[PDB]
Swiss-Prot record, chain A:
Family the entry assigns: Belongs to the protein kinase superfamily. CAMK Ser/Thr protein kinase family.
The protein's name in its UniProt record: Obscurin
UniProt PTM: Autophosphorylated by protein kinase domains 1 and 2.
Domain Ig-like: 4-94
Cellular localization per UniProt: Cytoplasm, Myofibril, Sarcomere, M line; Cytoplasm, Myofibril, Sarcomere, Z line; Cell membrane, Sarcolemma; Nucleus
Disulfide bonds listed in the record: C25-C76
Lineage: Eukaryota, Metazoa, Chordata, Craniata, Vertebrata
Annotated function: Structural component of striated muscles which plays a role in myofibrillogenesis. Probably involved in the assembly of myosin into sarcomeric A bands in striated muscle. Has serine/threonine protein kinase activity and phosphorylates N-cadherin CDH2 and sodium/potassium-transporting ATPase subunit ATP1B1.
Complex formation: Interacts (via protein kinase domain 2) with CDH2 and (via protein kinase domain 1) with ATP1B1. Isoform 3 interacts with TTN/titin and calmodulin. Isoform 3 interacts with ANK1 isoform Mu17/ank1.5.
Disease cited in the entry: Rhabdomyolysis 1: An autosomal recessive disorder characterized by severe and recurrent rhabdomyolysis, usually with onset in the teenage years. Some of the episodes may be triggered by exercise or heat; others occur spontaneously. Rhabdomyolysis is the rapid breakdown of damaged or injured skeletal myofibres and may require intensive care management. Muscle breakdown results in release of myofibrillar content into the extracellular space and circulation, resulting in hyperCKemia (hyperCK) and myoglobinuria. A chromosomal aberration involving OBSCN has been found in Wilms tumor. Translocation t(1;7)(q42;p15) with PTHB1.
From Swiss-Prot, chain B:
Entry comment on modification after translation: Autophosphorylated.
Superkingdom assignment: Eukaryota
Function of the molecule: Key component in the assembly and functioning of vertebrate striated muscles. By providing connections at the level of individual microfilaments, it contributes to the fine balance of forces between the two halves of the sarcomere. The size and extensibility of the cross-links are the main determinants of sarcomere extensibility properties of muscle. In non-muscle cells, seems to play a role in chromosome condensation and chromosome segregation during mitosis. Might link the lamina network to chromatin or nuclear actin, or both during interphase.
Annotated family: Belongs to the protein kinase superfamily. CAMK Ser/Thr protein kinase family.
Included range, full protein: 34253 to 34349 of 34350
Further comment found in the protein's record: In some isoforms, after the PEVK repeat region there is a long PEVK duplicated region. On account of this region, it has been very difficult to sequence the whole protein. The length of this region (ranging from 183 to 2174 residues), may be a key elastic element of titin.
Disease with which this protein is associated in UniProt: Myopathy, myofibrillar, 9, with early respiratory failure: An autosomal dominant myopathy characterized by adulthood onset of weakness in proximal, distal, axial and respiratory muscles. Pelvic girdle weakness, foot drop and neck weakness are the main symptoms at onset, but ultimately the weakness usually involves the proximal compartment of both upper and lower limbs. Additional features include variable degrees of Achilles tendon contractures, spinal rigidity and muscle hypertrophy. Respiratory involvement often leads to requirement for non-invasive ventilation support. Cardiomyopathy, familial hypertrophic, 9: A hereditary heart disorder characterized by ventricular hypertrophy, which is usually asymmetric and often involves the interventricular septum. The symptoms include dyspnea, syncope, collapse, palpitations, and chest pain. They can be readily provoked by exercise. The disorder has inter- and intrafamilial variability ranging from benign to malignant forms with high risk of cardiac failure and sudden cardiac death.
Domain-level remarks: ZIS1 and ZIS5 regions contain multiple SPXR consensus sites for ERK- and CDK-like protein kinases as well as multiple SP motifs. ZIS1 could adopt a closed conformation which would block the TCAP-binding site. The PEVK region may serve as an entropic spring of a chain of structural folds and may also be an interaction site to other myofilament proteins to form interfilament connectivity in the sarcomere.
Stated name of the protein: Titin
Domain Ig-like: 4-92
Annotated compartments: Cytoplasm; Nucleus
Amino acid sequence: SSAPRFLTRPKAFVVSVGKDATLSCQIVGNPTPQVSWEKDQQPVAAGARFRLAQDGDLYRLTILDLALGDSGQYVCRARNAIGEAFAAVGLQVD
Amino acid sequence: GIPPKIEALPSDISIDEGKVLTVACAFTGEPTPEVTWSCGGRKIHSQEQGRFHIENTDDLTTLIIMDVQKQDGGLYTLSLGNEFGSDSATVNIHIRS
């Protein structure tokens, strides 16, 4: 019945001289959308350093033990039978 | 004085025809920059073809294309401007048929 929508801008959180980052956004849609993250046009899969989680309409990608190679653009993709929503966020590791 | 800056815009996005597509993009800038979505030098206006919609808040702009058609495929440019400068980025939108 309704295409996905980002209620708030995707955000990337990191502390100065930090070792971990968290990326989150609030997404709604009817039916509830399938949400995934992409970097370098490849899906981000859960593992030891990449943690994916959901809490209602809030979706998270946490990156542990940051490496220089983790820098770049992350795209959040939300999809259901009606449509798809995309929003990107940058991460720069120093 | 803070020049505008587009947070991040994908370079390419694909969508099936007959679906709704939404692309959201965050930005910064002081004062709030004016937002322009364009197709080949021409500003796109909200409600064009009864399918295109643009919604802007103070730090987020969203391009909505309802009932995606094959003719909608193309380059869509987001531009921001204030007294301190401008920023611009383009997304290539591909339609799957």
